[PDB]
Amino acid sequence: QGHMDLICMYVFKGEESFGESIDVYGDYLIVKVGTEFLAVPKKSIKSVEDGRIVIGEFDEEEARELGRKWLEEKSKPVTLEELKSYGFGEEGEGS
């Protein structure tokens, strides 16, 4: 059960290459794009693929500002356990 490439799942905005999964906090997947961190909401993530994350649509400017709000709060020492998710999405590109 689960998927491969747990080290870094490639986040695709539908079909287009959006970014890469770097961090996960609360209800936001921190996606590293270009130079900055776009924190996409879980409602955007459609399906966890085998080493990929297909997301749909989301308010980019909002995900960007609460992304840099994460750049403020990340100053706290590493005890965030909510990042550690198994990837129970047995479905995806194949089964």
From Swiss-Prot:
<dbReference type="Pfam" id="PF19023">
    <property type="entry name" value="DUF5749"/>
</dbReference>
<dbReference type="InterPro" id="IPR043961">
    <property type="entry name" value="DUF5749"/>
</dbReference>
<protein>
    <recommendedName>
        <fullName>Uncharacterized protein AF_2094</fullName>
    </recommendedName>
</protein>
